[PDB]
């Protein structure tokens, strides 16, 4: 019974051996008094040959796709090799064939991928309703095995660096603010509920208070958000925390971990260290806090070059950002880019073509008086097209930032490879507008920069935080920060945020007390593992790297779960349905 | 700033080096113009010495227990070595000392364990309320680090054997029967709920149907049970499933996995293979389906020796089980054992002492007529005490089985080491009594023994299942079985269990359809990881091997979760509180 080899493992070196294989029939071909069966298992395909003189011929004649069988035979060299199958040089002459399970016709084909051919994927609702058949496809199994390899690589590296894996609670306390929590009724007392964790944040910080120098966990997180932007009700994160560290210790450890993961999983060598850009530098050069560095097209400030002369729009604005495109755009291409600029509420997009010794179209006449100085600042050459956005420094950068991205598509620029970078020095507080007090941009426990400590009172506007974001190809894959370990500083901060000393004792009471027993300096980070895997695989959605995901409504077509429960089961919990 | 070494890592080989250490003050001793501070971190303790001539003396004079500090000094040999501390041969002459965080007085001491001293534990409610301080104790950290090592060992071994780790859903469908499910309200539609998983059972079987030859996962399971028998609302299991296997392939793989874990984690060598006992053999020899093999005291059937003579009680009973204790019991010891026997509803405990050439006390007079035959069957010698339990074969065995265990305590027998064993050949159906149809003893998907297939109709009484339990020192740590992969056989089984073809389509509908697309033979097992860890560590409860557990009422003293939620938050979910 026991198989001798995986079907897709057979090679020219097995010629002459007697083998026993078990798997699925990928395809059957009757070539006239000769039946060929392509047997499949996780490692690949192998051609089986049944001749009329073989005792297995009768059974080979009744087999259909997806039937599970056990085959016995002699491995022999193929009269003609198939250059695209790892087992292409051999075939198995059958001596026996037995059916272990029959199968009805699948709603969609799963055989093409295994031949190296392109597949026609069925609608996603069908794939999800029959996920166990979708998971038989080569590409899906490659994604799941890659996810295994990545997590194993993470364990090998962190175990080697002294990190202790700690499992955190799933039934915790609900919090009045943040994101909406998923709740769990406490049977023994109506009105009491557990909440599923949005993140292990407080627990990993308490593990640092406990003296576990360094921790990690592949943690499942749950957030009941009105998400349609390709997000799942629950997702996976690599969670990590360390003690007695400064920002640089965290970044260096993560760069080395990430290079290890890519080397082991994809066999790709990443250059270290990763570039590091401050929030301000990223906004000015790329118009975004999550820059895509796979192409250039850097933004240039040219506002100074315009106030000595005089072109209305270009001077009432404190900033004039320019972008030099290596192509002569058409009127339709310009109009499309202008739409993008306006979406990010910018009054308009100005343009001009760069010809030999002069400009053409758009605002060309206003550029001639500064031609020389402009060509240097922008480094534009004949044939290029200049685009401008004038207005508030933040609006101009953000708007042109969006144009730069859309421009990469129209021009069909080559965006390949993996470009990682750290964005650091973010501000501590967010846009609280003009009525009253500020709010946090990261999380209440994020440490403000030490040298900026004093400014915390007189000008909390430009006080930076010790926070960092990890971005890959224009996408945020992770983020973290150095935490506040001083109970008094935490308060001083809570003074600014305007959170009452009665509200703190309600939403963070147990944690604030922990800080009074000697908390060491500490900090960490969390990676969106599903998102990282989707980018590593070039998948269009994180649903391609999760075995059994939910659809866009948060429902599960396979199990039909969000389902009704017996009225008495709810009554047992002391609950009744109403409206919402 | 950065430390040069972990405090507890210093050795005689570091003498002469300048070091920077960071940690907690475990204890301070003022020896008169000389202050000694024991600095602690995850690796252990180091003695720091501050002299009046040192710039660090002033600070050393104000430090208290649990304060976090950074110390700089020169390592030097100790004038007197401390033989019980890994760093006992050295000490650090301080040149500098800085306070990073002060700490108030802890509710209970955490310093003794680090010195090797016996530790005085506080009430469990206090330990849980201040779990981050409890976790500073040496024994708690040893437990957590051991848990890390065991899980890493499992990943190494299974990855090497070709298993693919797959993460399963946490939000699934609720099922009308089994154990009570924890529910999660579906916001977008009142009356709809997700259920937390009781086990990944159906998902790992669908992963076999998908063609992933072998899978594993360290899975979190949730069961809303009225548990007080040292059980948590959620627990962890090592979950594993394999394709194209027979019972023996699963047992062998698990024995090698377990031997690997014990060797890597504890440095203990387990003898393979593990003994295998059938359910019947285990019940007859030890009176239990989870036998403790750390000692003998095997049960003996002696009922046959009594029907030719005639002692009332000993004949109306189909069974008379005997146990020979290597000690002359007192009347109090006998009375205590009789209580245990009655607990497991047995009418009573008969006894007699074995003297030289005869019996004494109890039912001695009725034993004399069979003395020779009895002494052979029981192998009893002078000085031993014979115990008997007469009645239904099942009651006698179970009752005396309990007596054997309690007897091990009274006699103070030595029960040390780790004795693993497999209990196999369990029956397929349970005690459905005399009114109607049977019920399952394992799970609906457990495969009945093949050779017993026919008896499934005419005498389903003695049809065995392909199920197996893994036992360690009298405790069940795991269990699994070969699954049914034939949709027709599954039905045939459902015929016996009496489950309607409409109820199946409601509780297993999606899964029954999966079996029709070609399911391969498969089977697996699940280990109660928390229970295994508690046994490996000699812990009295699984709460000692879980970082943040719940108390006996399923509540969390640390966070105070089960908590009430705003009336409007519930209304948002379309729910209102009632009673229970």
UniProtKB/Swiss-Prot annotation, chains A, B:
Homodimer. It is found in: Cytoplasm. The keyword Transferase does not apply. Keywords: Aminoacyl-tRNA synthetase, ATP-binding, Cytoplasm, Ligase, Nucleotide-binding, Protein biosynthesis. Catalyzes the attachment of L-aspartate to tRNA(Asp) in a two-step reaction: L-aspartate is first activated by ATP to form Asp-AMP and then transferred to the acceptor end of tRNA(Asp). Gene3D superfamilies: Bira Bifunctional Protein, Domain 2, GAD-like domain, Nucleic acid-binding proteins. The gene is aspS. It comes from Thermus thermophilus. This is Aspartate--tRNA(Asp) ligase. SUPFAM superfamilies: Class II aaRS and biotin synthetases (SSF55681), GAD domain-like (SSF55261), Nucleic acid-binding proteins (SSF50249).
């Amino acid at each position: 019974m026991r198989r001798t080899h995986y079907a897709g493992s057979l090679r020219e070196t097995h010629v002459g051996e007697e083998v026993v294989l078990e798997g699925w029939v990928n395809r059957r071909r009757d070539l006239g008094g000769l039946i060929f069966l392509d047997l499949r298992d996780r490692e690949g395909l192998v051609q089986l040959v049944a001749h009329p003189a073989s005792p297995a011929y009768a059974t080979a004649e009744r087999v259909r796709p997806e039937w599970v069988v056990r085959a016995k035979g002699l491995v022999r060299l193929r009269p003609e090799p198939n250059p695209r199958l790892a087992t292409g040089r051999v075939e198995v002459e059958l001596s026996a064939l037995e059916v272990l399970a029959e199968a009805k016709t699948p709603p969609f084909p799963v055989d093409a991928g295994w031949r190296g051919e392109e597949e026609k994927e069925a609608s996603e609702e069908l794939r999800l309703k029959y996920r166990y058949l979708d998971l038989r496809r080569r590409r899906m199994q490659e994604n799941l095995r890659l996810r295994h390899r990545v997590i194993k690589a993470i364990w090998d590296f962190l175990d080697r660096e002294g990190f202790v894996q700690v499992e955190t609670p799933f039934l915790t306390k609900s919090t009045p603010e943040g994101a909406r929590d998923f709740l769990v009724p406490y049977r023994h007392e109506p009105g009491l509920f557990y909440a599923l964790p949005q993140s292990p944040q407080l627990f990993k910080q308490m593990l640092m208070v406990a003296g576990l120098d360094r921790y990690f966990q592949i943690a499942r997180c749950f957030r009941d958000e009105d998400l349609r932007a390709d997000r799942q009700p629950d997702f996976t994160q690599l969670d990590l925390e360390m003690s007695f560290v400064e920002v640089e210790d965290v970044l260096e450890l993560n760069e080395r971990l990430m290079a290890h993961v890519f080397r082991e999983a994809l066999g790709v060598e990443l250059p270290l260290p990763f570039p590091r850009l401050s929030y301000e530098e990223a906004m000015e050069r790329y118009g975004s806090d999550k820059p895509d560095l796979r192409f250039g097209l850097e933004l240039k400030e040219v506002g100074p070059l315009f106030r000595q002369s005089g072109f209305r729009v270009f001077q009432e604005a404190e900033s004039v950002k320019a972008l030099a495109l290596p192509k002569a755009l058409s009127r339709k291409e310009v109009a499309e880019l202008e739409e993008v600029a306006k979406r990010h509420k910018a009054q308009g997009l100005a343009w001009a073509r760069v010809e030999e010794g002069g400009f053409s179209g758009g605002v060309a006449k206003f550029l001639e008086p500064v031609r020389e100085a402009l060509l240097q600042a922008t480094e534009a050459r004949p044939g290029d097209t200049l685009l401008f956005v004038a207005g508030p420094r933040k609006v101009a950068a953000t708007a042109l930032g969006a144009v730069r991205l859309r421009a990469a598509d129209l021009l069909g620029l080559k965006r390949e490879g993996f470009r990682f970078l750290w964005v650091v020095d973010f501000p501590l507080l967010e846009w609280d507008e003009e009525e009253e007090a500020w709010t946090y941009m990261h999380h209440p426990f994020t440490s403000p920069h030490p040298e900026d400590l004093p400014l915390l009172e007189k000008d909390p506007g430009r006080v930076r935080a010790l926070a960092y974001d990890l971005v890959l190809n224009g996408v945020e894959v992770g983020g973290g920060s150095i935490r506040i370990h001083d109970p008094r500083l935490q308060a001083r901060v809570f003074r600014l945020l305007g959170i009452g000393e009665e509200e703190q004792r309600e939403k963070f009471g147990f944690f604030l007390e922990a800080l009074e027993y000697g908390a060491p300096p500490h900090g960490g980070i969390a990676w969106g593992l599903d998102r990282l895997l989707a980018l590593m695989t070039g998948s269009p959605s994180i649903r391609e790297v999760i075995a059994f995901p939910k659809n866009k409504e948060g429902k599960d077509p396979l199990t039909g779960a969000p389902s009704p429960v017996p009225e008495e089961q709810l009554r047992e919990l002391g609950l009744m349905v109403v409206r919402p």
